[PDB]
Amino acid sequence: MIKQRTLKNIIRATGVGLHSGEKVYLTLKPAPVDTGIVFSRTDLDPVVEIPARAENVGETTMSTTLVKGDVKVDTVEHLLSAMAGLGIDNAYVELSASEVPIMDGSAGPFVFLIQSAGLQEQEAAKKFIRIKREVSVEEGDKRAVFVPFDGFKVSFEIDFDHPVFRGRTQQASVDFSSTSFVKEVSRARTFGFMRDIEYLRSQNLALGGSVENAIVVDENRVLNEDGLRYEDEFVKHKILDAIGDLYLLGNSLIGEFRGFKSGHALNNQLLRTLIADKDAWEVVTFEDARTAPISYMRP
Ligand SMILES: C[C@@](CCc1ccc(-c2ccc(OCCCN3CCOCC3)cc2)cc1)(C(=O)NO)S(C)(=O)=O
Numbered sequence: 481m482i483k484q485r486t487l488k489n490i491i492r493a494t495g496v497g498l499h500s501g502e503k504v505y506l507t508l509k510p511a512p513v514d515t516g517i518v519f520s521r522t523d524l525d526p527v528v529e530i531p532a533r534a535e536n537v538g539e540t541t542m543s544t545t546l547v548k549g550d551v552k553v554d555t556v557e558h559l560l561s562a563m564a565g566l567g568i569d570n571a572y573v574e575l576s577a578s579e580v581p582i583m584d585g586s587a588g589p590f591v592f593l594i595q596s597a598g599l600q601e602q603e604a605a606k607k608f609i610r611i612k613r614e615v616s617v618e619e620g621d622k623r624a625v626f627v628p629f630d631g632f633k634v635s636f637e638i639d640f641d642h643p644v645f646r647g648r649t650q651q652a653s654v655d656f657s658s659t660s661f662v663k664e665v666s667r668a669r670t671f672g673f674m675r676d677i678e679y680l681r682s683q684n685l686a687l688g689g690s691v692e693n694a695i696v697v698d699e700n701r702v703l704n705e706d707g708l709r710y711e712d713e714f715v716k717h718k719i720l721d722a723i724g725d726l727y728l729l730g731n732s733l734i735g736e737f738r739g740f741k742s743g744h745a746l747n748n749q750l751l752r753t754l755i756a757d758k759d760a761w762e763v764v765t766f767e768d769a770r771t772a773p774i775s776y777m778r779p
């Protein structure tokens with residue numbers, strides 16, 4: 481059987497919010513079967529809890545934001561990508577401020593902190609959302625699509641009209657049966673344009689942004705002294721973002737995602753369309769891991 485997973489021990493981390501620039505304390509706690517991932521604002525009295533589900537996404541400007549009334553949890557995509565990649569179904573995510581810490585700009589530090597603590601398999605079958613029919617959303621020149629596939633595969637195409645992006649890999653495809661999320665996706669960092677820093681800052685975005693937590697792109701080069709971790713790091717980060725955003729379904733997917741210049745807004749619109757079209761999906765479990773089309777690393 482493919483079992484549900486939680487954390488073996490409590491995990492603590494500190495950082496700054498990419499967009500707010502605020503210092504934040506993060507705690508990851510084990511949770512019972514069928515809890516899902518629940519964010520908690522512990523700096524508030526009373527404490528506000530927000531399940532990490534598509535219905536709770538309130539803003540998609542330059543990150544995915546969870547909203548409950550006037551309470552927000554910003555930039556959940558990188559932590560959710562780490563949790564999806566490691567197969568964590570149930571956990572409590574406590575935060576001392578309105579934004580998840582950016583860390584090094586990738587899912588790498590989250591994956592390491594989680595794997596250092598270890599995972600705990602739970603006595604319940606892990607539920608998956610299996611894609612039965614193609615579901616596609618478009619808006620202008622952007623496209624996000626779910627296609628049936630017996631496993632989990634992500635394809636992505638970006639197209640930035642900038643010298644640092646031309647001649648560089650702008651398309652990547654990753655099948656999770658033959659490719660490790662940890663090795664090939666988790667370390668891909670977020671990126672931004674230095675030209676836009678003053679504009680973004682006037683919109684309350686990228687206030688904590690620097691070479692320490694992002695690939696900062698200048699007019700003709702990457703500013704980061706040590707360069708890139710991957711030649712295709714930019715498109716690999718978009719795959720990391722898609723994995724995190726898709727995890728807002730509340731379960732792992734059995735299918736294929738294809739992104740064409742898409743981002744947080746369109747990824748959430750694709751989940752809303754899928755959720756609504758009940759003939760395009762179903763909940764499945766694998767009562768025998770020996771015959772399942774997917775496998776997870778040892779806990
Ligand atoms: C939305 C998205 C990007 C988020 C994002 C947005 C902006 C920046 C960003 C932009 C400029 C910058 O210059 C800092 C200026 C520093 N200067 C340099 C010159 O010296 C003084 C300091 C630092 C950081 C970084 C990341 C994401 O990852 N969401 O998850 S994406 C990849 O999907 O588009």
Ligand SMILES: [Zn+2]
Pocket residue numbers: 557558670717721
């Ligand atoms: Zn990102």
